[PDB]
Write a protein that binds this ligand. Structure first.
Ligand SMILES: Nc1ncnc2c1ncn2[C@@H]1O[C@H](COP(=O)(O)OP(=O)(O)OP(=O)(O)O)[C@@H](O)[C@H]1O
Ligand SMILES: [Mg+2]
Lengths: 455, 98, 107, 87, 93, 95, 86, 107, 93
DNA sequence: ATCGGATGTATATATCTGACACGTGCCTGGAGACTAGGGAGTAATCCCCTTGGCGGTTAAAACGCGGGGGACAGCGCGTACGTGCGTTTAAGCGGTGCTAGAGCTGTCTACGACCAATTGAGCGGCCTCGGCACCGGGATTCTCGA
DNA sequence: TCGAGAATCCCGGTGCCGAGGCCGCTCAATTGGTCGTAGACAGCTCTAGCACCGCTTAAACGCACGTACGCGCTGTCCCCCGCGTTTTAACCGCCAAGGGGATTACTCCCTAGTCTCCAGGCACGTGTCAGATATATACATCCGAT
């Protein structure tokens, strides 16, 4: 069959050999009337491989057709700017904007069939589902396809109603929590082949009796390439855990929360995490009014206190920092801190508008890049984007899901980094943060020590 | 010149369209916040069923609508068309709850 | 012999046996007569039929073929006996009767 | 400073003026004085306090920690305003 | 566990009254609450009647008097007619 | 002569200080018997039963007159009127 | 044996009696149309109470209406009366 | 052994045994606990003492040594908690509270 | 036949409160009906509390909850204190 | 604005009187002691429902502005009502007779509780389709400036 | 006055979702005997409700007058409504955690039932004192001439 020996002719630029192998894998998958999970590690050109496969489908099999690309809201522009760069002949648009502009775009292009690729987000797929369901899609592509790890989610249910000739799933972290998530992803690709929750669960039941069976079962439907056996030029990450104490204010507030000391405290863990991040996240802690930002912020929070010294030292060495957080208000506190320290931040969060996200990414990635730090939230700004300019990643607080942090760190450890990437996870001593770190470590081991290791 | 309705026509239109419908007129989230804050003074750290909050909202809205009908009657009795705090107070006084 | 429900014997649709049990386990009296459940079930069935007939008429007047709380509310509030019986009752999702005072209407 | 944007300065203020106007329209009211809104908020607060106090008493007697729709229904029935449609 | 209700009986009465109309879940819940409320009212009045008269048994005439006390106007006459007719039919068989 | 309203206030004070019954007993008894004969012919009444009825009726009427006075004062008047009584009963929920 | 209505007994609630009741209610000035309305209101109230009392009496299989029957009827209407038993 | 009333054991004036009998012969529940009559008797005694204190003060205010229904009415209606408790209650031969609206007084 | 009243107990409480004050027969009858009314309210609330909670026993917990439900404000607190004191004294003896 | 004079109300005193507080005898209901059994408290389990914060979408809320119409004060004018007088009638009191009815007592006896075996009716779970909710587009109606 | 014009109503079309129908448990309602007691029936008694009559006198009724109040009209002003713009907070979906509620099994202890006293509460006289009644007096207050 077509083994595509060399770099695609129609594709501008030259792609590395493993990308050609991945494209060949996709072609073979297509011919054998099956669908797979392109699951290379975070940083390798999965998007380029998908675009090259689409270029093959349009130029060698002569099927321009309708193509659907579902991606997180922060990566729509990246998809557009790469389709227009590698195969600058495909008609592709983003179905985003107000419901008036969305209606205009639908009536003009979608219902006029004046398009080749429709890029959309997970929210616009559930919302503009009636016009989109009226198309016989040839390929339905889902970037960061671990969002459908739950089969009862409305996105999954809506997606199981479209008509599609074939499907493709892209994600760098296929296994999230347990094995049922993998079944939820596979039931979308091959609903007829698997179709079975209990059979899948009990054929496997979480030596060699099952793990090798895992490798044989997913062998035809999943392809993984690790960044160490493939790139061998990107330097590996040097991650460090900065254990910190607590401030007297933090000690007092932690004691008050644990000793049940009119405000409603129904989720103890979340309040303890808020205390460990910054005491000012609690209403009334900050001295005032009048409220001033002068210096009190930095010393009554141990994490911010360590961060100040590390950030100063890095600025002297001349590095640029990425700072991720689980909370958006803590990101406001960090905004105010960089205001007083006279830094140049480039915040993006879940409430940031589309064009604002585009502008922030380009400003931080622009040549000479006068911005110093990037403020992101691990959920909104922790997927797909390409902040390879920076070299230091600071994880201000850990997540219950270790993969949500792996994604965040790999926003700088990708193709075209040519630097040393240093990760500083900030952990608070003798708190709940150690508990979440332990649980995340166990969940990480569950999959990494077992299934994806041989890949 | 633009088109403006007389100062009392839109009001009748809203009266008709709101007496024809049956949905809840208060926003759910603010009402939930109010309920939890009020309840916090009797017992600390209570949980609430969604159906419980829904029942409270239904009862409260029915109560306020009936009170507004009584207030309207009092205002019309005073030969006005605007309702006033004195009208509300009189309605609650006659009902035996003040 | 062949079991025959007491509802069947009395020509009713409501459960005479269930009503009898609910009377016995309700701490209403030490002893419960034989005809009390029959009488009570017949009365309950009559009241149910009255409300349901009025609500079905109200549903028909709106060109609908399913009774909803709005129709129940309209039926109850539009006749005096049921309005007096359910005088202190709120029907959830029921609304109000359309009624504008005459002095508010334009001249 | 973007840390200190604002709070809603009470939860009773979340019963907004448009909502009170909608309730008045369902009640049949045509004009509304400007002082009606504070009065309505006070009245609603009193009503809610009574009902919730009774419901919480029922919940504590049942030795539970979550208020249920049945508790709310019993409290309303005790105060003399029966509610249909919740149990 | 099992929750018993009056839903099937209300549906039977509905099919007798309007053979072609349906009923929604919320409406059925409201009908169930209505039936329970009326049962409780009548049973309570009959109970305290029996207590007033120093009896210890709740009989069909206690139920009749409770119905007369509770139902208004023309509802009472028709409800009493229905109850008497049912009791006669039952005692005859 | 006393000006209109002086004797009315004296009567208000007198009758809010006293506690006896303000309707004559024989007319009220005749009214009770006449009303009762429409429910069961040839009824008999205990004297205490008739007294209980009079007590309840007078309490009900006095409370109604208090509410009617409030409605009249709300309408910026000092004379009570049938519309005042009707409004009071409508608000109380007896209509 | 013998029973009839004599002299239209609702007019035995005279105008002075109604004025005395109004004075106890705190009323200073009385319209001339209050009296007929008051008589109608009193008749309706008495009709409801006496209907319930007679229902109790004939359930008890008696022919005499008792103060306890009146008290039970008032409690049914929601107007408890202290001082006559119960 | 000699007998001691449950009221004396609980330090009350109201009768615990009579309350127990009335509880278990009034169709309230299948069973009655041992402490329920004691609690109920104590509560009833407390309320009685409250009302009688207020009525005795009222009777003294009139230079009388016997409590009458007028004194009971004055006590109940002047005390706000008791007025809420007895809001729907009529006291025979009680009268009303003296209260004239200020608009009716001479100018 | 005999008729049972609360008159002697009410008189004892009165002599405790005001040692030199009497009471007339009409006022005593009013107090008797007041005690019966409050008894009925509290016992009915306790009964339906036990019914709600699927208990077949009326205990001092039911009585205390019913008192809290029925009495307003300060009365409820003082009555609860009195009842608890009496139950403790009874149990200790 | 301020005295003079009627006028109604509260106060003190002496007098019955009938209603309350007291003392006596009985019986019935409460307390003590014992037994038996079943209701509820206790501990363990599990799984489900609540909580909290975020991400994106978007419709409602908040603010400002222009104007008209409704509330409120003032004035004048009948008219309806309050006050007082004289007259009569009917209510309240009392005393009497009577007889209908309500309550107590004793005796069955039919009816309701209890119990064990059994089966069928109701519930919970699982499926489809028809009724109802948007949705655009035309018709009709009503309002506001002429 | 009649011609714009904005809102509402049909009305046909589409989809989607919630109502209706079907299939296995399982538990509760039915059947058949067995008791025992709650109530129905007959008889008797006494009491209290009714009917009548006579007297008295206080309250109700009818009339007249004059005043003050309810009502209608006018004018003003201010405040609330209708409308447009922007953004912000609600809404819904997502994603974790874990606390709390519902179930089950076990046992013990607390309550009911029984029998036997016995003392406390009720009914019944009985004196006697708090209070209602009548009379005289002083005072606060209202209403009309200076
Ligand atoms: N053949 C190539 N030549 C040059 N650059 C490439 C090539 N392939 C990929 N890249 C670089 O990789 C970046 C694109 O990111 P990529 O498509 O690898 O994201 P991903 O790793 O697939 O997604 P995620 O990191 O979210 O899993 C681009 O900036 C591009 O410069
Ligand atoms: Mg990517």
């Amino acid at each position: 069959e077509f083994q595509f020996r060399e770099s695609p002719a129609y594709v501008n630029g030259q792609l590395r050999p493993y990308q050609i192998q991945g494209v060949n894998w996709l072609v073979s998958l297509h011919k054998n009337k099956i669908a797979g999970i392109l699951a290379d590690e975070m940083g390798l050109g999965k998007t380029l491989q998908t675009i090259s496969f689409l270029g093959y489908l349009r130029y060698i099999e002569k099927i321009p057709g309708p193509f659907l690309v579902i991606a997180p809201k922060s990566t729509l522009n990246n998809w557009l700017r790469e389709i227009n760069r590698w195969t600058p002949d495909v008609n592709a648009f983003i179905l985003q904007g107000d419901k008036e502009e969305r209606a205009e775009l639908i009536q003009k292009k979608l219902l006029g069939c004046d398009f080749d690729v429709v890029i959309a987000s997970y929210e616009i797929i559930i919302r503009e589902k009636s016009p989109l369901k009226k198309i016989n899609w040839e390929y339905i592509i889902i970037d960061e396809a671990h969002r459908i790890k739950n089969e009862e989610s409305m996105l999954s249910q809506v997606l199981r109603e479209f008509t599609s000739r074939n499907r493709l799933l892209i994600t760098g972290t296929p296994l999230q929590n347990n094995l049922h998530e993998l079944w939820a992803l596979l039931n979308f690709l091959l609903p007829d082949i698997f179709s079975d929750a209990q059979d899948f669960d009990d054929w496997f039941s979480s030596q060699d009796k099952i793990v090798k069976q895992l490798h044989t079962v997913l062998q035809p439907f999943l392809l993984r390439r690790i960044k160490s056996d493939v790139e061998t030029s990107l330097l590996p990450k040097k991650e460090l855990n900065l254990y910190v104490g607590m401030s007297s204010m933090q000690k007092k507030w932690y004691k008050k929360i644990l000793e049940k000391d009119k405000t409603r405290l129904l989720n103890i863990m979340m309040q303890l995490r808020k205390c460990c991040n910054h005491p000012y996240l609690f209403d009334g802690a900050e001295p005032g009014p009048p409220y001033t930002t002068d210096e009190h912020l930095v010393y009554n929070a141990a994490k911010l206190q360590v961060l100040d010294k590390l950030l100063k030292k890095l600025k002297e060495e001349g590095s640029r920092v990425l700072i991720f957080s689980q909370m958006s208000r803590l990101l406001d506190i960090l905004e105010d801190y960089c205001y007083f320290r006279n830094y140049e931040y480039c915040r993006i969060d879940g409430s940031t508008a589309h064009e604002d996200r585009i502008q922030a990414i380009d400003d931080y990635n622009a040549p000479d890049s006068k911005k110093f730090v990037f403020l992101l939230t691990t959920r909104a700004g922790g997927l797909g984007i390409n902040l390879t300019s920076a070299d230091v990643v600071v994880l201000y607080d850990s997540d219950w899901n270790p993969q949500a942090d792996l994604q965040a760190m790999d926003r700088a450890h990708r193709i075209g980094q040519k630097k040393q990437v240093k990760v500083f996870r900030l952990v608070t001593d003798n708190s709940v943060e150690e508990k979440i770190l332990e649980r995340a470590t166990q969940k990480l081991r569950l999959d990494q020590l077992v299934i994806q290791q041989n890949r | 010149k633009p088109h403006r309705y007389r100062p009392g026509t839109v009001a009748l239109r809203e009266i008709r369209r709101y007496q024809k419908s049956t949905e809840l007129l208060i926003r759910k989230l603010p009402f939930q916040r109010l309920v939890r804050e009020i309840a916090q003074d009797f017992k600390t750290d209570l949980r609430f069923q969604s159906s419980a909050v829904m029942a409270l909202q239904e009862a409260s809205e029915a109560y306020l609508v009936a009170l507004f009908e009584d207030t309207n009657l009092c205002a019309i009795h005073a030969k006005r068309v605007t309702i006033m705090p004195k009208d509300i107070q009189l309605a609650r006084r006659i009902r035996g709850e003040r | 012999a062949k079991a025959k429900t007491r509802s069947s014997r009395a020509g009713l649709q409501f459960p005479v046996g269930r009503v009898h049990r609910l009377l016995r386990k309700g701490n209403y009296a030490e002893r419960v007569g034989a005809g009390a459940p029959v009488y009570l079930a017949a009365v309950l069935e009559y009241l149910t039929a009255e409300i349901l007939e009025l609500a079905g008429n109200a549903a028909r007047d709106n060109k609908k073929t399913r009774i909803i709380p709005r129709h129940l509310q309209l039926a109850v509030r539009n006749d005096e006996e049921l309005n007096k019986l359910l005088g202190r009752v709120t029907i959830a999702q029921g609304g109000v009767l359309p009624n504008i005072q005459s002095v508010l209407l334009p001249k | 400073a973007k840390r200190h944007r604002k709070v809603l300065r009470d939860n009773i203020q979340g019963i907004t003026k448009p909502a009170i106007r909608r309730l008045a329209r369902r009640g049949g009211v045509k004009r509304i004085s400007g002082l009606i809104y504070e009065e309505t908020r006070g009245v609603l607060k009193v009503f809610l306090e009574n009902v919730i106090r009774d419901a919480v008493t029922y919940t504590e007697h049942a030795k539970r920690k979550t208020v249920t729709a049945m508790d709310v229904v019993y409290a309303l029935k005790r105060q003399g305003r029966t509610l249909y449609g919740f149990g | 566990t099992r929750k018993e209700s009056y839903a099937i009986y209300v549906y039977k009465v509905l099919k007798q009254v309007h053979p072609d109309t349906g009923i929604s879940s919320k409406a059925m819940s409201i009908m169930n609450s209505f039936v329970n409320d009326v049962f409780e009212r009548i049973a309570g009045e009959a109970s305290r009647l029996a207590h007033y008269n120093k009896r210890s048994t709740i009989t069909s005439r206690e139920i009749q008097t409770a119905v007369r006390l509770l139902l208004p106007g023309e509802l009472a006459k028709h409800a009493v007619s229905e109850g008497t007719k049912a009791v006669t039919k039952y005692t005859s068989a």
